[PDB]
Structure formats: structure tokens, C-alpha cells
Amino acid sequence: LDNGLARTPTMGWLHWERFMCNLDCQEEPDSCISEKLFMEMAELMVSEGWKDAGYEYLCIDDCWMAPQRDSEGRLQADPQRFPHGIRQLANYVHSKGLKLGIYADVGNKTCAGFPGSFGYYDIDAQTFADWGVDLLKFDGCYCDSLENLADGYKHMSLALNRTGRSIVYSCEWPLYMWPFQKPNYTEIRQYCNHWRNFADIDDSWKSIKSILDWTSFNQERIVDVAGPGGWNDPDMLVIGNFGLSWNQQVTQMALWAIMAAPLFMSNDLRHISPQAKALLQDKDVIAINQDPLGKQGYQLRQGDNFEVWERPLSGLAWAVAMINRQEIGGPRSYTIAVASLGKGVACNPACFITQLLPVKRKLGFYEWTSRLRSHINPTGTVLLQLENTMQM
Amino acid sequence: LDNGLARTPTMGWLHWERFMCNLDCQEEPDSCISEKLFMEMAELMVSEGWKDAGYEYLCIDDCWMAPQRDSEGRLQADPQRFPHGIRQLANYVHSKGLKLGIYADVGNKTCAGFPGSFGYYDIDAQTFADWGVDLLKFDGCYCDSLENLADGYKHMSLALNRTGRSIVYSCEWPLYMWPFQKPNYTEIRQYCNHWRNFADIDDSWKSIKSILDWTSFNQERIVDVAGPGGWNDPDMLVIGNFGLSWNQQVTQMALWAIMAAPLFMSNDLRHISPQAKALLQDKDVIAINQDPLGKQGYQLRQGDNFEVWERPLSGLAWAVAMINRQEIGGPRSYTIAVASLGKGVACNPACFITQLLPVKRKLGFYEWTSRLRSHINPTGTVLLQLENTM
Numbered sequence: 030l031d032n033g034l035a036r037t038p039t040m041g042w043l044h045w046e047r048f049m050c051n052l053d054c055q056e057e058p059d060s061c062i063s064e065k066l067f068m069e070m071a072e073l074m075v076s077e078g079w080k081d082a083g084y085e086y087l088c089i090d091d092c093w094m095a096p097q098r099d100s101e102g103r104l105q106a107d108p109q110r111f112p113h114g115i116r117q118l119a120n121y122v123h124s125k126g127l128k129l130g131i132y133a134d135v136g137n138k139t140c141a142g143f144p145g146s147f148g149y150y151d152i153d154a155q156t157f158a159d160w161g162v163d164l165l166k167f168d169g170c171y172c173d174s175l176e177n178l179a180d181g182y183k184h185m186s187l188a189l190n191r192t193g194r195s196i197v198y199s200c201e202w203p204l205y206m207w208p209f210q211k212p213n214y215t216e217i218r219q220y221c222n223h224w225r226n227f228a229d230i231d232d233s234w235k236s237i238k239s240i241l242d243w244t245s246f247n248q249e250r251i252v253d254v255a256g257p258g259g260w261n262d263p264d265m266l267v268i269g270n271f272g273l274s275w276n277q278q279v280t281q282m283a284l285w286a287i288m289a290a291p292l293f294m295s296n297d298l299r300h301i302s303p304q305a306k307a308l309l310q311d312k313d314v315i316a317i318n319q320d321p322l323g324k325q326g327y328q329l330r331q332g333d334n335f336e337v338w339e340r341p342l343s344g345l346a347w348a349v350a351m352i353n354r355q356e357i358g359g360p361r362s363y364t365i366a367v368a369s370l371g372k373g374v375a376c377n378p379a380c381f382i383t384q385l386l387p388v389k390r391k392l393g394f395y396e397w398t399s400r401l402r403s404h405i406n407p408t409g410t411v412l413l414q415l416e417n418t419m420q421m
Numbered sequence: 422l423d424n425g426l427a428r429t430p431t432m433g434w435l436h437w438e439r440f441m442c443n444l445d446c447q448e449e450p451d452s453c454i455s456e457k458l459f460m461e462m463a464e465l466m467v468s469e470g471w472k473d474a475g476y477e478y479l480c481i482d483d484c485w486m487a488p489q490r491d492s493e494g495r496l497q498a499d500p501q502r503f504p505h506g507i508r509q510l511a512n513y514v515h516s517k518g519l520k521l522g523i524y525a526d527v528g529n530k531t532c533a534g535f536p537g538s539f540g541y542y543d544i545d546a547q548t549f550a551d552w553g554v555d556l557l558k559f560d561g562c563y564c565d566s567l568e569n570l571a572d573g574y575k576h577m578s579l580a581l582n583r584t585g586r587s588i589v590y591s592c593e594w595p596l597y598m599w600p601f602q603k604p605n606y607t608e609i610r611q612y613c614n615h616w617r618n619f620a621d622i623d624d625s626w627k628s629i630k631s632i633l634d635w636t637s638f639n640q641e642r643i644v645d646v647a648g649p650g651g652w653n654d655p656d657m658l659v660i661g662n663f664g665l666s667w668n669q670q671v672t673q674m675a676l677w678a679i680m681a682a683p684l685f686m687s688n689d690l691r692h693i694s695p696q697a698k699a700l701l702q703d704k705d706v707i708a709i710n711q712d713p714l715g716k717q718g719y720q721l722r723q724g725d726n727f728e729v730w731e732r733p734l735s736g737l738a739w740a741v742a743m744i745n746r747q748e749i750g751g752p753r754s755y756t757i758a759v760a761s762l763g764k765g766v767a768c769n770p771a772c773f774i775t776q777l778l779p780v781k782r783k784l785g786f787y788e789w790t791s792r793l794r795s796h797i798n799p800t801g802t803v804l805l806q807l808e809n810t811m
């Protein structure tokens with residue numbers, strides 16, 4: 030999408046994985062989808078360093094809407110859970126230096142069953158702009174035809190443009206195409222700032238593995254489509270939640286950097302461990318994800334329950350991720366000729382290698398003919414940065 | 422097995438899951454299966470509080486053997502990796518106040534391909550006794566018949582008895598029977614101090630779930646046979662390794678206590694987090710696992726992606742574990758009438774309830790009329806101890 034937005038992958042927070050569609054504010058008040066949840070989350074995004082790290086978009090997902098539109102056919106926030114309204118929430122968010130994302134559906138209803146935007150694309154776009162929305166995640170439930178799907182996605186893209194407000198446009202279009210036909214990613218990129226490709230993430234290592242395995246299996250088809258203005262979206266970061274070991278969290282952070290993924294945390298910033306926070310706020314890894322060249326990485330090698338991924342960065346640098354997929358035993362040794370990394374460019378004539386994950390260690394100068402040896406924890410990843418150099 | 426041993430579930434350390442069959446001491450000297458590894462673990466078991474917490478048996482698994490037996494037909498430790506011999510290793514372990522466990526196989530070869538004990542049962546038992554071995558894990562690979570399997574396990578039990586030395590006897594007999602016929606756990610308990618029922622654990626939440634689901638699936642068959650002298654073995658604790666989140670480690674510790682499981686850590690005591698250490702050394706949870714009554718717990722309820730397990734303890738007390746198996750979202754609320762717990766006696770007329778995991782907190786007194794509500798983390802467990810007021 031050529032709207033001047035998402036020149037690097039969007040960074041923020043999105044409620045869906047951690048909070049889902051909890052409407053029971055009487056018995057689960059700290060988990061329910063309410064304006065107080067988002068206000069507190071914005072406060073912590075400021076005070077706990079998240080905005081400084083680059084997480085800027087505070088995003089509402091499904092289940093914010095009143096069950097029906099108003100008399101003038103406009104969407105309404107829930108009067109009990111969002112009594113002060115989206116525009117006041119947006120003013121509060123903007124006053125913290127943050128941006129506000131919201132959710133709508135291309136079809137007749139949201140996936141949870143709330144008012145869809147079909148037949149109201151222009152109304153809803155102008156409504157969001159009037160409220161001060163800075164991002165829209167557009168879901169694809171309740172759409173009777175792929176023709177209506179594509180028409181609605183393109184139509185909403187155009188309507189958002191017509192508002193004249195800069196609104197990041199996040200689409201689930203490809204994922205809702207897959208059962209019927211393969212997506213044309215050139216068209217999707219024409220209309221969307223990023224697009225969900227695969228099934229919803231959940232709080233499990235199984236989910237991480239399946240997202241990685243489908244990305245790598247399909248990388249011929251999606252890697253080159255991504256770039257400044259339009260990104261592949263492998264779904265939310267779930268670091269800080271319950272189902273990932275420390276090494277599996279390292280793997281998700283490292284590989285979302287490799288994949289040039291949007292970094293949308295879905296966690297509770299009121300209850301997050303220091304380790305998870307330091308991982309999510311890791312400035313070197315964020316800098317890899319946010320690299321200005323904006324070329325998505327890929328799986329370079331796979332075998333013996335190992336994976337090697339790499340990502341080209343600005344200035345002849347490369348990021349290299351080694352994953353140990355053996356889920357038994359201890360750290361396993363992996364050796365590779367540095368000439369095989371970075372298309373043979375990264376270390377020609379030499380490279381300086383810095384390990385960033387799981388811990389930051391300068392490894393030293395590696396000549397083009399040398400070999401790199403590492404040990405990788407079960408289900409963990411070693412993330413390296415290679416900097417091309419003529420020095421020793 | 423009525424040998425005076427394992428009157429509570431055996432506690433110790435066993436190398437297999439974390440260190441496996443690593444024979445490459447040239448390139449991996451700190452990870453290879455060698456006497457140095459076991460010496461370091463014994464040192465840390467003393468110095469880092471493991472022995473004081475109850476972890477007593479330092480156990481060698483497969484891949485300690487030389488490729489062939491000795492002149493008189495007796496097993497030998499690998500001369501390069503165990504140069505000083507098992508007896509001196511056992512001496513060192515005993516001098517730390519610890520006990521030494523070793524590994525052998527009922528068939529013609531061990532699972533990794535080293536000498537089996539078929540045809541050498543009495544020789545091998547007497548050799549282990551001479552070495553000062555205190556526990557034998559007896560594997561089931563390379564056995565060509567169910568009758569040879571049963572006969573071998575029973576024979577090795579008898580041979581160990583005949584040596585005169587108290588030796589904990591850990592059996593994989595049921596696991597190797599199960600695909601072909603249902604085990605008779607009365608006989609197994611007669612011959613074994615504990616027995617592996619299900620497939621090898623690995624460093625994953627998936628294997629924890631599989632072990633729990635197969636235990637509850639089989640609980641009418643295995644729960645009542647367990648007791649002092651004879652335990653179900655759901656395999657090693659993997660707390661402190663790489664694949665389990667904090668809440669999944671809590672679930673393993675809590676449910677291994679509920680199940681009156683042997684607690685054999687398989688981790689690197691040289692490199693273990695303070696949190697994993699405090700969980701593994703948790704005195705209240707170990708006390709539940711080690712409860713003298715020795716009645717294995719069971720799954721009480723299952724539904725709505727929740728599980729409730731409970732275990733009767735000495736002196737009118739009960740342990741209760743609640744598992745949230747929903748792997749998405751946040752802590753989920755679960756409510757149960759306390760009159761439904763402990764077969765209706767735990768809280769009649771009332772009980773004091775103490776949460777032990779994931780954090781310890783006294784909850785207060787609950788009357789027979791009361792309902793207990795808790796929020797349980799995805800893949801985590803809330804573990805409670807109930808004390809009857811009487």
C-alpha cells in the first residue's frame with residue numbers, strides 16, 4: 030500500500046490473543062474488553078518503555094462494538110464497556126504519544142458476530158477517521174463470495190484513502206482466500222499495509238512451529254512480495270504469556286525479526302516478567318526487524334532437526350538465525366562455513382559477528398574462508414548479526 | 422516390591438533426558454556420559470541443597486558400558502569414560518551421603534546397543550551388589566518374547582534379592598508389555614519398586630500432556646496398585662531444561678506430587694535457574710509427593726478444558742490440583758464445591774485451604790457449603806492443600 034505508512038513493519042499491541050472476546054466485565058473485570066483496559070495499557074506502554082522501544086499502535090481487536098449501529102447507520106462502541114466512546118479513547122491515546130488501532134470486518138458481521146461493514150465501507154471509514162483511528166485491522170468473516178471479499182478489501186482501502194487521514198490498513202484477505210484459490214499477493218500488496226497469511230496464533234510452541242513451517246514451505250511465494258509499505262503478517266507476538274519457554278520466546282522474537290513481521294504484542298503489560306520485557310524491548314533485535322532495507326528473510330537450510338534462516342540488512346550486513354528443532358537432550362553443536370551465509374557477501378572479505386540471542390556476545394572477526402561454530406538450545410534460536418568489513 | 426525400599430517415591434537424578442547417549446568426550450567433554458559428569462552432579466547435589474530437599478539417588482542411565490564383558494563374563498564400565506570403575510564412583514557418591522543407581526537391560530542388548538543381561542541375570546546382580554550399586558533401572562529392549570520379558574524381570578528381581586544388598590528395582594516391564602497384552606500390575610508390584618507405564622518423556626509440553634492423559638485414561642487400572650514399596654513411574658522430571666514454560670514446569674511438579682511419582686530430575690545441575698531450583702526444592706510440594714500414606718492421586722473431573730485431580734494424604738488432609746488445558750487467552754476461572762473434593766470428607770464440616778502453586782498463599786477456612794474459585798493460567802496448575810478443621 031502506497032500510503033506512506035508501514036515503511037518498516039508496524040509495532041504495537043493488540044488484545045486478541047491474550048484477552049479474546051471477554052464480555053463478562055462483572056465476573057472477569059480485569060480481562061473484559063473495556064475502555065479501562067486500553068487506557069491502562071496505554072499508560073503502561075508509556076511508563077514501562079514500550080513506546081520508546083517502538084511499540085506505538087495500541088490496537089482494539091474484535092468485540093468492541095455495540096450489537097447494532099445507531100440511527101444514522103454508524104457503528105457504535107459498546108455503551109457499557111466503552112461508555113466514553115472511541116473518539117475520547119483516541120484523544121487519550123494520542124495524548125500519550127500513541128496511535129490507536131481498531132477492528133472491523135469486510136463481511137456482514139465480525140467473526141464474533143458484531144456489525145459487519147458490508148454496505149457501510151465509506152461510512153465506517155469516515156467514522157474511524159472522525160474518531161481519530163490510526164489503524165484498522167480488517168477481518169474476513171461472513172463474506173459470501175471471494176468477489177465480495179476482494180471488492181470489500183479494495184473498497185475499504187479506497188474509502189480510508191478518501192478520508193485523507195493516514196490509517197494503517199491490516200488485512201486478513203489472503204487467509205480467507207486459501208480454501209478456494211491461492212492469493213495474488215501483488216494485488217493484496219497494492220491495497221494493504223500488511224496481510225495475515227496463516228491460521229491464528231495461540232499460546233503454544235506448536236503454534237510457533239506451524240507458523241514457521243508454513244512460512245518456510247511457502248517462502249518462494251511470499252518472501253519477495255514483502256517490502257516497505259507492505260508486509261507478511263505471521264500474527265501476534267505471544268511473548269510474556271504462559272505457553273512458551275524462555276527459549277521458545279527467543280525463537281519467536283528472533284524469527285519475527287528475520288521475517289520482517291509486524292510486531293504486535295498480545296499480552297498483559299500489567300503482568301509481564303522482566304525477562305519477557307527485556308526480550309521484547311531488545312533494541313538490537315528490534316533494529317533488525319525495523320531494518321530500512323525492508324527485505325524479508327528466509328530459511329536457508331533445513332535438516333537434522335536444525336534450521337538456518339537469514340535476512341539481508343542495510344549496508345551489506347546480515348542477520349542469521351539457527352534453530353534447534355530437537356526437543357530432547359541439551360544444546361547441540363552446529364558448524365557452517367561463513368561463506369555459505371549472506372549469499373557469500375556478508376563475510377567477503379571478512380565479517381564481524383555479534384551474537385544477539387539468547388545473550389549478546391561479540392564473537393569476533395571471521396574471514397571469508399572461516400567456519401562458525403555455535404551451540405543451540407532445544408527449541409531455542411541463536412541470532413547473529415554479521416557486519417561486512419575489510420578489517421582483520 | 423517388599424524389600425524395605427521406596428516406602429516413599431524414590432527421589433534423585435538420572436542423566437538420560439538431558440544428556441542421552443553422548444559418547445563424544447573429545448569434542449563435548451562436559452556433556453559426555455563419563456564419571457566426571459556424575460562426580461560433578463553428586464558434588465552439586467550436596468552443595469546446592471538437593472540432598473537436603475530429598476534427592477538422594479544419583480543414577481546412571483544407558484551408555485556407561487564397555488562394548489564387551491570381562492573374562493569371567495562380567496559387565497565392565499567404559500575404560501575411557503569411566504576409567505576408575507563403578508565401585509570407586511559408588512564410593513565417592515556414598516561419601517557424599519548419596520546413593521548410586523545404574524542401568525541394565527533385560528534383553529540381549531541395551532536400547533543403545535550395549536551388552537544386555539539376558540543369560541547373565543545372576544552374574545549382573547551380584548556384580549552390581551559388589552560395586553555398591555543402590556538402584557537398578559532395568560530396560561526392555563531387544564527381548565524377543567513376552568515370556569522372556571516377564572521371566573527376565575522376575576529373575577533379575579530375585580537375583581538382586583539374593584545378593585543381600587538393598588537395591589531399588591526400577592522396571593520398564595509394563596511399557597514393553599502394553600502393545601501386546603495388558604500388564605498384570607499385581608505381579609509387577611510384587612517384583613518391582615516402580616515401573617514405567619508410558620513412552621519416554623522429552624523436553625516438551627506435548628509429552629507432559631500425553632503422560633497425564635494416558636495416566637488418567639488408565640487410572641482405574643494403575644492407581645490402586647501404587648503404594649509404599651511400589652509406584653507408577655511417569656518418567657523423569659524435566660524442570661530446568663529448555664522446552665517447558667514456567668507454568669508447564671509448575672504443572673509437572675504439581676502432578677508428579679499428585680501421582681506419587683518417583684522424582685528423578687534429568688537436568689544440568691551446573692546450569693539451572695533459581696526459579697526452577699526453588700520449584701524442584703519446594704518443601705511443601707515434595708512433602709505431598711513424599712506423604713507417608715502413599716496413596717496415589719487421581720483425576721476427579723475433566724471438562725471445559727479443565728482438569729481436577731486430587732490425592733488423599735495422611736491425617737485427614739488432601740491435595741487438589743486444577744489444570745487449565747486451554748492454550749490461548751488468559752487465566753481462566755474455575756469453581757468447584759468443596760463438598761465435591763476429597764470424596765466429601767475433606768471439608769466436612771470445614772477445611773483450611775492453602776495454595777502451594779504457582780505461589781503459596783493461605784486462602785482461609787472453607788465450610789462444607791462453600792465453593793472454591795480459582796484463576797488458573799493456560800497450561801498451568803493451581804495446587805492446594807486442604808486440612809480438615811476437626
Ligand SMILES: *[C@@H]1O[C@H](CO)[C@@H](O[C@@H]2O[C@H](CO)[C@@H](O[C@@H]3O[C@H](CO)[C@@H](O)[C@H](O[C@H]4O[C@H](CO)[C@@H](O)[C@H](O)[C@@H]4O)[C@@H]3O)[C@H](O)[C@H]2NC(C)=O)[C@H](O)[C@H]1NC(C)=O
Pocket residue numbers: 031032033034036189190192193194195196
Ligand atoms: C491515497 O492514495 C494515494 C495514491 O493512491 C497516496 O499518495 C501516494 O503515496 C505517497 C504519499 O505520501 C506518494 O509518495 C511520495 O512521492 C513523492 C514524489 O516526489 C516522493 O518524494 C516521496 O518520497 C518520500 O517518502 C517515501 C515514503 O513513502 C520515501 O520512500 C522517500 O525516500 C521520501 O522520504 C513519496 O514517495 C505517492 O507519490 C502518492 N502517489 C500518487 C499521489 O499518485 C496518498 O498518500 C493516499 N492518502 C492517504 C490519506 O492514505
Ligand SMILES: *[C@@H]1O[C@H](CO)[C@@H](O[C@@H]2O[C@H](CO)[C@@H](O[C@@H]3O[C@H](CO)[C@@H](O)[C@H](O[C@H]4O[C@H](CO)[C@@H](O)[C@H](O)[C@@H]4O)[C@@H]3O)[C@H](O)[C@H]2NC(C)=O)[C@H](O)[C@H]1NC(C)=O
Pocket residue numbers: 423424425581582583584585586587588
Ligand atoms: C528379599 O525378599 C524378602 C521377602 O520379600 C525381603 O524380606 C522382607 O523385608 C522387609 C524389610 O526388610 C520386611 O518388612 C518388614 O516387615 C516387618 C513385619 O514382619 C516389620 O516389622 C518391618 O517394619 C519396618 O518398618 C517400620 C515402620 O513400619 C520401621 O520402623 C522399620 O523400617 C521396620 O524395619 C518391615 O516392614 C518384610 O517383612 C520381609 N518379608 C519376609 C517374607 O521376610 C527382603 O528384605 C529382601 N531382601 C533384599 C536384599 O532385597
Ligand SMILES: *[C@@H]1O[C@H](CO)[C@@H](O[C@@H]2O[C@H](CO)[C@@H](O)[C@H](O)[C@H]2NC(C)=O)[C@H](O)[C@H]1NC(C)=O
Pocket residue numbers: 135136137147171172173174177178
Ligand atoms: C450479506 O447478506 C446479504 C443478504 O443475505 C447478501 O446479499 C445477497 O447476496 C447474494 C449473493 O452475494 C445474492 O444472491 C442475494 O440476492 C443478496 N440479497 C440481498 C437482499 O441483497 C450479501 O451479499 C452479504 N454480504 C457479504 C459480504 O457476504
Ligand SMILES: *[C@@H]1O[C@H](CO)[C@@H](O[C@@H]2O[C@H](CO)[C@@H](O)[C@H](O)[C@H]2NC(C)=O)[C@H](O)[C@H]1NC(C)=O
Pocket residue numbers: 605606607608611
Ligand atoms: C495377577 O498376578 C497375581 C500375582 O501373581 C495373581 O494373584 C495370585 O493368584 C493366585 C492364583 O493363581 C493366588 O493363589 C494368589 O494368592 C495370588 N497372589 C499372589 C501373590 O500370587 C493373579 O491371579 C494374576 N491375575 C491375572 C488376571 O493374571
Ligand SMILES: *[C@@H]1O[C@H](CO)[C@@H](O)[C@H](O)[C@H]1NC(C)=O
Pocket residue numbers: 213214215216
Ligand atoms: C495479480 O494482480 C495484479 C494486479 O491486479 C496483476 O497485475 C497481475 O497480473 C495478477 N497476477 C496474476 C497471476 O493474476
Ligand SMILES: *[C@@H]1O[C@H](CO)[C@@H](O)[C@H](O)[C@H]1NC(C)=O
Pocket residue numbers: 527528529539563564565566569570
Ligand atoms: C537372545 O538371542 C538368542 C539367540 O538369537 C535368543 O535365542 C534369545 O531368545 C534372545 N533373548 C531375548 C531375551 O530376546
Ligand SMILES: CNC[C@H]1N[C@H](CO)[C@H](O)[C@@H]1O
Pocket residue numbers: 045090091139140141168201204228229
Ligand atoms: C482467522 N483470523 C481470525 C481473526 N478473527 C478474530 C476476531 O474475532 C481475530 O481478529 C483473529 O485474528
Ligand SMILES: CNC[C@H]1N[C@H](CO)[C@H](O)[C@@H]1O
Pocket residue numbers: 437482483531532533560593596620621
Ligand atoms: C522405552 N524406554 C526407553 C529407555 N531406553 C533409554 C536408554 O537407552 C532410556 O533409559 C529410556 O528410558
